[PDB]
Amino acid sequence: MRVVVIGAGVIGLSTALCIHERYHSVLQPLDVKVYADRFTPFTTTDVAAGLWQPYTSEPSNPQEANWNQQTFNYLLSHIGSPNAANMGLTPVSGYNLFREAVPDPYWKDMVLGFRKLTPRELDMFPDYRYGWFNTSLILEGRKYLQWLTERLTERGVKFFLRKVESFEEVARGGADVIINCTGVWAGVLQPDPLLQPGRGQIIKVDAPWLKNFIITHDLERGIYNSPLIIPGLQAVTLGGTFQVGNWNEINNIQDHNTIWEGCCRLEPTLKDAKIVGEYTGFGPVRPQVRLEREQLRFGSSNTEVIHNYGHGGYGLTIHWGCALEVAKLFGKVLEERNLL
Amino acid sequence: MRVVVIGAGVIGLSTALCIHERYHSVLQPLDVKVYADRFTPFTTTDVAAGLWQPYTSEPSNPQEANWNQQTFNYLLSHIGSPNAANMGLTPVSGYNLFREAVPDPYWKDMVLGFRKLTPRELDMFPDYRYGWFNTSLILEGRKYLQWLTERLTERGVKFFLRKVESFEEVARGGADVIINCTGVWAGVLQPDPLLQPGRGQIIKVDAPWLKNFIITHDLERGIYNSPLIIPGLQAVTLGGTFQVGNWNEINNIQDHNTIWEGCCRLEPTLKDAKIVGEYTGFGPVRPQVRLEREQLRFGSSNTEVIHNYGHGGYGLTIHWGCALEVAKLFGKVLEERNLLAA
Numbered sequence: 243m244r245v246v247v248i249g250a251g252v253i254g255l256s257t258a259l260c261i262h263e264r265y266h267s268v269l270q271p272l273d274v275k276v277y278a279d280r281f282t283p284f285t286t287t288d289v290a291a292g293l294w295q296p297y298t299s300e301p302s303n304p305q306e307a308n309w310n311q312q313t314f315n316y317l318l319s320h321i322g323s324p325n326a327a328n329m330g331l332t333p334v335s336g337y338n339l340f341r342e343a344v345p346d347p348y349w350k351d352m353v354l355g356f357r358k359l360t361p362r363e364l365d366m367f368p369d370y371r372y373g374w375f376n377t378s379l380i381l382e383g384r385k386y387l388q389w390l391t392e393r394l395t396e397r398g399v400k401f402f403l404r405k406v407e408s409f410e411e412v413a414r415g416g417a418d419v420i421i422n423c424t425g426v427w428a429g430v431l432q433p434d435p436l437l438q439p440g441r442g443q444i445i446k447v448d449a450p451w452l453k454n455f456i457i458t459h460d461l462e463r464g465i466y467n468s469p470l471i472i473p474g475l476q477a478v479t480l481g482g483t484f485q486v487g488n489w490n491e492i493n494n495i496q497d498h499n500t501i502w503e504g505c506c507r508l509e510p511t512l513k514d515a516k517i518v519g520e521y522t523g524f525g526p527v528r529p530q531v532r533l534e535r536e537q538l539r540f541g542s543s544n545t546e547v548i549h550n551y552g553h554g555g556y557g558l559t560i561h562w563g564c565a566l567e568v569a570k571l572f573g574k575v576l577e578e579r580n581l582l
Numbered sequence: 583m584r585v586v587v588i589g590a591g592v593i594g595l596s597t598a599l600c601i602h603e604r605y606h607s608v609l610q611p612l613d614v615k616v617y618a619d620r621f622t623p624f625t626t627t628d629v630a631a632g633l634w635q636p637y638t639s640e641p642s643n644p645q646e647a648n649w650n651q652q653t654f655n656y657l658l659s660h661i662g663s664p665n666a667a668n669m670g671l672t673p674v675s676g677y678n679l680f681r682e683a684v685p686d687p688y689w690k691d692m693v694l695g696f697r698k699l700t701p702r703e704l705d706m707f708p709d710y711r712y713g714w715f716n717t718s719l720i721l722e723g724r725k726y727l728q729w730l731t732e733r734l735t736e737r738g739v740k741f742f743l744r745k746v747e748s749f750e751e752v753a754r755g756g757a758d759v760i761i762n763c764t765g766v767w768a769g770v771l772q773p774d775p776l777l778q779p780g781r782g783q784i785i786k787v788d789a790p791w792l793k794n795f796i797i798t799h800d801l802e803r804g805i806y807n808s809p810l811i812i813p814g815l816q817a818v819t820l821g822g823t824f825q826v827g828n829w830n831e832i833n834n835i836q837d838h839n840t841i842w843e844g845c846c847r848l849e850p851t852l853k854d855a856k857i858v859g860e861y862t863g864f865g866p867v868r869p870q871v872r873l874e875r876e877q878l879r880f881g882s883s884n885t886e887v888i889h890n891y892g893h894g895g896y897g898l899t900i901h902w903g904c905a906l907e908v909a910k911l912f913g914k915v916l917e918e919r920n921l922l923a924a
């Protein structure tokens with residue numbers, strides 16, 4: 243049984259590993275390969291701020307709430323292990339800041355120690371009048387990618403750096419199942435006009451004194467179009483733009499300014515932070531994650547495609563529940579093929 | 583008038599600045615000088631883990647509670663300012679871990695968001711069954727010392743390398759008031775057998791991924807004789823020994839081991855941390871802080887000494903309240919001499 247996962251971003255590798263760990267022991271042969279035209283550090287996952295937190299508003303599909311939860315508990319269960327940091331994983335506490343009262347988020351009980359900020363805490367943030375405190379996890383994408391590829395490699399999964407032109411060519415090259423984990427570029431293999439790039443720019447900074455995440459919201463502005471500060475493993479991420487529809491891969495001057503001034507005002511000590519790097523990523527924005535299976539027909543073998551894309555600005559946050567779901571759909575595929 | 587502060591640790595410089603800021607404008611001339619035989623980075627303050635947290639048990643003098651509180655609110659009021667990190671100041675959250683239930687600490691309301699740990703949080707710390715979460719402040723001693731000396735220097739206060747042999751010599755050199763901020767060595771200038779060194783050893787480490795403080799307690803072995811982990815401004819402090827009565831200034835292997843294994847078991851990711859330095863400090867341990875006024879006589883001139891030493895393992899935590907108290911006593915000294923504040 244030959245499985246090609248297309249994509250080496252967080253979604254690809256997580257899904258690839260989950261499939262292998264679930265079925266290596268029961269299927270023989272099972273051959274899993276990863277194709278992609280960029281690997282770390284060249285994916286959007288690499289640019290990700292690296293924090294577990296869903297959108298403040300609930301999701302359309304309630305399965306996603308669950309996929310987030312599964313992802314959190316998965317990640318939390320690693321805290322305590324010697325290799326947590328090598329995976330890019332470590333606990334962080336921080337603040338969500340609003341200019342007025344808002345409902346509690348659907349994920350309040352999933353995180354650790356959710357509570358509302360007290361009048362004292364707020365004086366720390368002059369420009370805001372309401373907010374939350376909680377404890378969550380950093381998942382640094384660059385590092386987690388390095389961990390997964392190593393974990394994949396150790397188990398004999400093989401990587402191929404290449405550009406897939408169609409699902410057809412890959413099936414024709416001998417894939418029985420295709421897991422489509424192509425992020426914002428899924429539309430090149432099958433038009434999907436619900437999928438748009440969520441263009442976010444970030445500034446990477448050396449400011450090791452900052453131990454807490456700080457995320458502001460501007461309800462009249464759209465999610466992550468207000469300043470945010472997220473301590474990483476060895477640097478800090480500064481953001482404040484997330485504009486959907488823009489396909490520009492290059493850094494922009496106006497965005498640099500919006501992020502720097504917004505964050506400098508939020509966290510004035512930034513005046514002495516050294517700028518280390520500036521990047522631009524595309525979140526695969528979609529009303530809903532596409533995680534379903536599809537039957538494609540070329541030549542003689544019917545080939546099965548399982549999509550797993552459109553995780554917007556929360557791919558790190560939801561990834562494991564999504565992989566888990568794909569490996570189950572895959573199980574069904576094995577079934578119908580009397581393969582167990 | 584002429585004021586000599588003896589000591590350039592956190593207590594000396596704090597007290598010096600507070601006195602200057604309160605009385606520069608009302609006394610003329612006011613001449614404040616600092617004498618010490620070590621400055622940053624060679625004081626015990628420099629070796630301090632750098633975290634705001636009093637002892638878990640209540641203090642003998644309840645005033646120290648207030649002094650801790652004042653210190654916290656003072657420091658908190660700077661969060662939001664551009665210069666917070668330059669002062670060595672930044673917020674941190676973390677965990678206090680116990681093997682069994684304990685009373686809430688007297689300072690629970692002073693910190694931010696004190697609460698008890700939940701069963702899930704405890705899963706992160708296999709060896710422990712009860713604890714707290716809260717948010718507090720880092721005050722890195724090395725950095726704060728640098729800030730204070732700069733702030734002192736800008737206001738014309740002058741620093742002198744000098745080992746003081748007696749209070750007499752300094753008075754005879756023309757000091758009207760002496761502020762005694764000599765830490766654990768105060769006994770050299772006036773015996774005080776209540777003062778003992780609290781020898782603590784620490785390992786400084788590069789483990790930037792660790793954002794939270796983690797302090798374990800062993801109620802039977804005494805305070806800070808159980809592993810503790812404190813993220814600093816650009817490195818992490820690892821500890822687990824605090825033995826009173828030992829005057830050994832050299833690092834020892836047994837303590838290095840107690841700290842490394844204890845902390846590696848607490849925080850297993852430390853396996854990849856690079857060791858960047860190892861130190862040994864002496865906390866000026868005392869049943870309580872000596873902060874009182876004393877009149878000394880040498881040849882019919884009255885010299886006024888105000889002591890401010892014996893802050894044990896909490897000098898950073900309590901310093902500002904203690905400085906504030908010294909300024910008050912100094913104000914009283916002025917009153918008695920018919921001099922007028924405000």
Ligand SMILES: Cc1cc2nc3c(=O)[nH]c(=O)nc-3n(C[C@H](O)[C@H](O)[C@H](O)COP(=O)(O)OP(=O)(O)OC[C@H]3O[C@@H](n4cnc5c(N)ncnc54)[C@H](O)[C@@H]3O)c2cc1C
Nearest residue numbers: 250251253279280287291292293406425442523557558559
């Ligand atoms: C600035 C920014 C900050 C973010 N911060 C966070 C955060 O803090 N927390 C969080 O949870 N999420 C965050 N996100 C969202 C998260 O980064 C994304 O949802 C996630 O990285 C998308 O992962 P992916 O694997 O689906 O796509 P990608 O990471 O882009 O990977 C896609 C892969 O598909 C491959 N590919 C595509 N088409 C082809 C083809 N035809 N042939 C071969 N290979 C192909 C690419 O080479 C690539 O390897 C952020 C996003 C941005 C832009």
Ligand SMILES: Cc1cc2nc3c(=O)[nH]c(=O)nc-3n(C[C@H](O)[C@H](O)[C@H](O)COP(=O)(O)OP(=O)(O)OC[C@H]3O[C@@H](n4cnc5c(N)ncnc54)[C@H](O)[C@@H]3O)c2cc1C
Nearest residue numbers: 590591593619620627631632633746765782863897898899
């Ligand atoms: C390992 C360790 C970790 C600690 N961690 C923390 C923590 O996280 N938080 C906290 O609040 N506290 C902590 N402490 C306690 C804290 O370090 C002390 O309470 C504080 O540093 C004492 O400050 P000080 O200025 O009185 O003494 P010091 O910092 O020792 O300064 C003493 C000064 O007096 C001078 N001096 C003495 N005698 C003479 C003389 N005859 N002539 C001239 N100069 C003289 C010295 O040269 C020096 O300048 C820790 C202590 C240790 C050992």
Ligand SMILES: c1ccc([C@H]2CCCN2)cc1
Nearest residue numbers: 291293295442466484555
């Ligand atoms: C753009 C910018 C930042 C993000 C992060 C912030 C915290 C979780 N998602 C997503 C998208």
Ligand SMILES: c1ccc([C@H]2CCCN2)cc1
Nearest residue numbers: 631633635782806824895
């Ligand atoms: C010895 C060792 C450590 C300490 C610190 C740990 C946190 C606050 N006091 C004091 C004394």
